[PDB]
């Protein structure tokens, strides 16, 4: 089962969404692509050894999304990002149910489209968000508040 990426979707979110569509573990996707543990590293936003051309093309062969498009699920060259905290604009999620790579940019604190501060934890119960690959439903894993409803609590 193939999936079309959402605009701005992060690599972690896309990988997990592909895995859920195919009932794959991270190790299973890694074996399908021939790169093993690299998949789980990318899902946790760990890129000490940045994604190589061969690794991106290996994943591209499985998910049928070109390496160039996969690179747009990561920050451009020179744009610093953070693996933690995982962040969210609930108003964006209501429009398109994905984590955006921009929300991990170190320079980003406000959603430009919605002119709201982005969230660094659930505004109802304060639970931090899991890595985007594990965003199985669109709700806080603790209190079960929908990400879309968190828009109403954004400042």
């Amino acid at each position: 089962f193939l999936i079309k990426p959402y605009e701005g979707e992060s690599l972690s979110h896309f990988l997990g969404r592909f895995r859920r569509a195919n009932h794959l573990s991270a190790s299973g996707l890694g074996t399908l692509a021939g790169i093993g543990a690299i998949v789980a590293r990318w899902e946790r936003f760990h890129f000490n050894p940045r994604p190589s051309q061969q690794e991106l093309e290996a994943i591209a062969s499985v998910v049928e999304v070109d390496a160039q498009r996969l690179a747009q699920m990561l920050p451009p060259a020179g744009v610093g990002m953070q693996h933690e905290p995982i962040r969210l604009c609930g108003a964006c999620y209501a429009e398109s149910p994905c984590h955006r790579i921009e929300w991990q940019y170190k320079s980003v604190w406000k959603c430009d489209r919605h002119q709201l501060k982005i969230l660094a934890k659930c505004p109802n119960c304060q639970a931090p968000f899991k890595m985007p690959a594990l965003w199985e439903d669109g709700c806080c894993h603790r209190c079960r508040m929908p990400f879309a409803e968190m828009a109403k609590l954004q400042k």
């Binding site: 659930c122 109802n124 119960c125 304060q126 639970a127 931090p128 968000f129 899991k130 890595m131 594990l134 965003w135 199985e136 439903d137 669109g138 709700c139 806080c140 894993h141 603790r142 209190c143 079960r144 508040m145 929908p146 990400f147 409803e149 828009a151 109403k152 609590l153």
Partner: protein, 260 residues
């Protein structure tokens, strides 16, 4: 006419909810337990119609959501799967409230479920098939009912009573019950006629549920609402498949002997 026949068979395949006195007593009792946060346990036979009635009590209080605050869900209905652990149960609780889970330990799931459970102002925790979950989870549901003040209704077959009996606290805390009746009597005949009018939705051929039909259906269903539904739907579909406009005697005889 073929399109009409397909519509008829599709409608007959789909089940409906006829509101009768059994479900009326049930949601009256449920409202009474809800207004006092009294945790009870509705029990009954199998294939008798408890799940549908609890479902109706769930949809009647359809959560009304504020513009920018979590939707307030007064009644929570869950049917945990076989050997449901505590993590699985908490996942289900926070999933029904539309809060997708985050990967973590059992403590993390418990904390998130508690947070979202107080956030939405839940009044009822309806655990259908409450004979499936492990006894290491009954402590968790006990803690929920103890601290969060949510009336929990444990729904299941009579085996649920045996499951809770071997435990100590869950039996004492959950003691109020509402056994589902067999429905046999004149109320059963009223049920047959009401079903004929509503669920069958066939042209009026004056079947009227005659004495012979009542005897056949009594011998067939043995009082079960589910068996009555299955037999009626099977007879209607078999009559409509063979071109018969109404339901004849041969089809009831065939479905009755096929069952017993």
């Amino acid at each position: 006419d073929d399109e009409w026949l397909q519509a008829e068979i599709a409608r007959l395949k789909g089940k409906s909810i006829v509101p009768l006195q059994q479900v009326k007593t049930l949601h009256d009792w449920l409202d009474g337990k809800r207004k006092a946060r009294k945790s009870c346990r509705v029990v009954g036979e199998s294939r008798t119609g408890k799940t549908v009635a609890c479902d109706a009590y769930r949809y009647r209080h359809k959560p009304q959501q504020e513009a920018g605050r979590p939707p307030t869900v007064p009644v929570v209905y869950i049917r945990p799967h076989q050997k449901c652990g505590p993590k699985d149960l908490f996942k289900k609780i926070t999933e029904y409230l539309k809060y997708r889970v985050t990967k973590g330990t059992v403590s993390d799931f418990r904390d998130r479920t508690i947070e979202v459970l107080k956030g939405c102002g839940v009044e009822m925790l309806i655990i259908d098939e409450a004979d499936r979950l492990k006894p290491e989870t009954f402590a968790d549901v006990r803690d929920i009912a103890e601290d969060l003040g949510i009336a929990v209704v444990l729904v299941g077959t009579d085996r649920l009573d045996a499951v809770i009996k071997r435990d100590e606290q869950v039996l004492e805390r959950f003691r109020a019950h509402l056994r589902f009746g067999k429905l046999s009597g004149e109320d059963f005949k009223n049920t047959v006629e009401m079903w004929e009018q509503m669920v069958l939705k066939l042209p009026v051929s004056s079947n009227l549920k005659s004495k012979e039909m009542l005897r056949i259906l009594t011998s067939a269903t043995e009082g079960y609402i589910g068996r009555l539904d299955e037999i009626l739907r099977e007879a209607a579909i078999r009559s409509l498949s063979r071109g018969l406009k109404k339901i004849d005697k041969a089809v009831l005889q065939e479905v009755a002997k096929e069952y017993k």
